[PDB]
């Protein structure tokens, strides 16, 4: 079960990628939007999931914000578990 929660890692990487793709898709078309290219969108996602939120990038559209919210929870839940498991096996 310990490394079975390590499956959250699987989920997270998927949400991060989908998030990045979806983020760009939602943001382009929004005048001034900066989250409009995949690479950095991918960086934005980690920045967001880890909840570090630097401010160098963020969504300005409604769906962009929705994708963001999903990524945030994914991150929080995911890291929650990996921490709880590392706490168990030690």
């Amino acid at each position, epitope marked *: 079960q310990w490394r079975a929660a390590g499956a959250a890692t699987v989920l997270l990487v998927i949400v991060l990628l989908a998030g990045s*793709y979806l983020a*760009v*898709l939602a*943001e*382009r*078309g*929004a*005048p*001034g*939007a*900066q989250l*409009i*290219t*995949y*690479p950095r969108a991918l960086w934005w996602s980690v920045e967001t999931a880890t909840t570090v939120g630097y401010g160098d990038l963020y969504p300005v559209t409604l769906w962009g914000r929705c994708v963001a919210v999903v990524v945030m929870v994914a991150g929080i839940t995911s890291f929650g578990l990996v921490t709880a498991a590392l706490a168990t096996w030690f």
Partner: antibody
Amino acid sequence: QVQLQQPGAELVKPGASVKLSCKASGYTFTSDWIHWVKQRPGHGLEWIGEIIPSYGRANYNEKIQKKATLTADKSSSTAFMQLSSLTSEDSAVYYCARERGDGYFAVWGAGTTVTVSS
Amino acid sequence: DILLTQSPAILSVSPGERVSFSCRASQSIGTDIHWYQQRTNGSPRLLIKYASESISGIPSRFSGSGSGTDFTLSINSVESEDIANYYCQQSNRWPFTFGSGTKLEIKR
């Protein structure tokens, strides 16, 4: 091999519409965007709009009157730009270009010269 | 939307001389600037990406520099084949925009 193939020219009578095509080859990714750029003789490059074939969504330059409607056929790897109700102001070379979702136009088509005349 | 100013519109240089094209953005765009070359009756061709990254196939003669609002495209030792119009383009914010272009003229 030529990554983007566009027809050489299109003659359109004032008020009529025309559908330009852009046939793409080479590597294709879900992150590719196909852009269209307009260039009048002796003038610069003007961005018209973009479309993401993998999803089908299109965005347009808000600063100019909307003359185009973009679509894409995944099976034939072809992108289309429908220009409607044209006037001589619409006469120009229309390029299609491919962007790998990373901000720059890696490659351009040869361009289609559109002439609006009777 | 981001305005890209390319001035002067025409640049005259002597053969083998180094030349520099200017591109100024209305606001800071990091290094999200790309340069294209367009010869008479030809289609645009990517020369430099992200302000200073080389593109395979382009002569070493071409280089770029700058970040923020001011960018430069340089050609070391210009030659006839470099005669063309040069455009900058930004991808920092939507929508992507193009500069108005600078023509390279050689005084032989």
